Amino acid sequence: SALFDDIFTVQTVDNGRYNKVSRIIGISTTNSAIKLTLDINNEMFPVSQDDSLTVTLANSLSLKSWRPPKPTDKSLADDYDYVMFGTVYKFEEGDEDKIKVYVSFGGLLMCLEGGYKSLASLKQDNLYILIRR
Amino acid sequence: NLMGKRVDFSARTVISGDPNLELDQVGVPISIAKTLSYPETVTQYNIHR
């Protein structure tokens, strides 16, 4: 029920500009040349260098007016630690097999490279990102 | 007296700022709102008022 499952190894984390927000860069451990840049809330999901993150991209959390979740219901986000919602604002079907996707998580930005055969299904309107560890 | 002249039905007072007014709204003091007037012809849609 997910669009892009993968495991990433965090390379650099520039806390830097902000206080609650850090930008991370990570290459997939199983399929290199897949790069991931992602802004994350430090206070909600602190991340250190060389850590290993299971990163999921999904078009839904199921298995239009936001209401707080009950304990009794279940969704895909129940198995993860950090879930964000975003808007795809650029799909770069560019060079030979460089495909860049741009997602805006309320101003927290993400970029995802890789071959076309990995990110072809990532051409949507809105995307969820889920993270473990 | 010809290029410019004094006119009736005018008012003047200090201005203040109001974050809660709309852009095309002006807040008018009650005393000025009662001193100034508008002539409204009586018709069959506004006679009760």
Partner: protein, 113 residues
């Protein structure tokens, strides 16, 4: 010369109701309440009490102008529940909490002697 009276904050006229309820038709099972002659003291108390109930989906208030002593409150609830009953429930809960607080303060003050 244009200053209104300082007692119109609290003295209710005879032609002005204390409370007036209208429904918000845009979203289901929501109501708009205007409290006349009240201010942040009651509004914030009620808002933060109601915001912690599971069955309350939306609750908010505003004082559109500081020079007028009223506030308006939007409250939505789930399908089965009615926002009015939740409003009475919140009022009763705050009343009970204040009664317990008063009882404990009086006992503590007596013990301090």
């Amino acid at each position: 010369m244009n200053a209104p009276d300082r007692f119109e904050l609290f003295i209710l006229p005879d032609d002005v109701p204390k409370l007036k309820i209208t429904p918000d038709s845009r979203v289901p099972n929501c109501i708009i309440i205007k409290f006349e002659r009240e201010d942040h003291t009651l509004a914030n108390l009620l808002r933060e009490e109601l915001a912690l109930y599971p069955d309350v989906t939306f609750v908010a208030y505003k004082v559109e102008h500081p020079l007028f002593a009223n506030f308006v409150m939007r409250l939505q609830t789930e399908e089965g529940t009615r926002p009015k009953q939740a409003l009475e429930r919140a009022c009763a809960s705050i009343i009970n909490k204040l009664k317990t607080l008063d009882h404990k303060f009086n006992e503590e003050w007596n013990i301090k002697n």
